[PDB]
Amino acid sequence: PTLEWFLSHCHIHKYPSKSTLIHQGEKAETLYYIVKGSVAVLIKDEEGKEMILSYLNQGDFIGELGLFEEGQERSAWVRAKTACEVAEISYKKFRQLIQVNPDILMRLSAQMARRLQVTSEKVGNLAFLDVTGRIAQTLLNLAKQPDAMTHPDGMQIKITRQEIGQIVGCSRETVGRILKMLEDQNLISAHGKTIVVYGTR
Template sequence: MLAVNTQSSGLAANRPLGNPFPQDPNAPESPHLDAFLSAAHRRKYPAKSTLIYAGDKSDSIYFILKGSVTVLVEDESGREIIVAYLNKGDFFGEMPLFLDDNDPRTAWVKAKTECEVAELSYAKFREVAHKHTELIYAVSNQMAERLRRTTQKVSDLAFLDVTGRVARTLLDLTKQPDAMTHPDGMQIKITRQEIGRIVGCSREMVGRVLKTLVEQGLVSVKGKTMVVYGTR
């Protein structure tokens, strides 16, 4: 079974990774989310379209009703790092709500799949939250969880080699909604380039790591379809 060994830079079978992308425990039937959705505008986006541009004015919070989005940042030369995948039940664009300034957006948000979101202005959000204080806790809970995941990612970049980071990423991806059950584990679809954008390395380096994992009998790879053995 593929696992991450945090005591060294390699792989081990002693520490399977938990789900780093948990779904929001709040169901849409919750009164505070009902109030949010009643006040929000619903918008649909095709896959690969851009919902938020880095540098845009920060004035709205979003809630994912359907589908998945990718949060990413890029440098001046256009190199990208994927920060997170967000799914149904997740808020995004919330951070400026809790800041005194109104700086522009710092990250891009793009539709990973066809998706539907509920968009609510910050001013309207504050009105709704004044009557439904649970809404603040729901958003704050997700912010705290993302901070935990960001801390883990910083730790990975500092203490895991590329093989360890790729292994952790594959395990993370088996917990995403679009992962499929396979007789030998979980099947995912992702390109080497996209894995590189998550772990911070080249596509060629990802290819070499995947070849090693295949040789070790931990995964199978056919194009962008991969099976991570022993996962569920």
């Protein structure tokens, strides 16, 4: 449909792992779209602690905020998590496609609504719910993600002990303590990054 009409003017260019698709400081002159794989977006402070806002899997767009208002810069950093195939379309030639077919814009701004609902309703849980409650909800949220692999016992995901604290809002030390505590009670499992939870499904 409209999606196929979008790939007719794209520029196929594969990006290796640990690459740089979006550099905070450069000029936004290329729209990116995810075909296969996944990518992560995060920011940094003055020390070195990271902070992931939201994850973007396949079928999502990369850097679309610098399209509505011409003359902007890259907000956050976008590092390629895994081998992903991303297209390339200049914003200049994109604006001409909207004036002749606004329907194409109805697709991009359609995914910008869900990314706001999962963030606004998350703040409330990061002010009342304790560590046990915040992490508990996170386990189910990551299980609903398409990048999650089906497990005979439950769900198998791969996330570090830092990214967890960046979602529930806490220190990295606290995460490791509770994580190992649930292991003794036979509730979940962890072997570095891969965390297999139980009770799901």
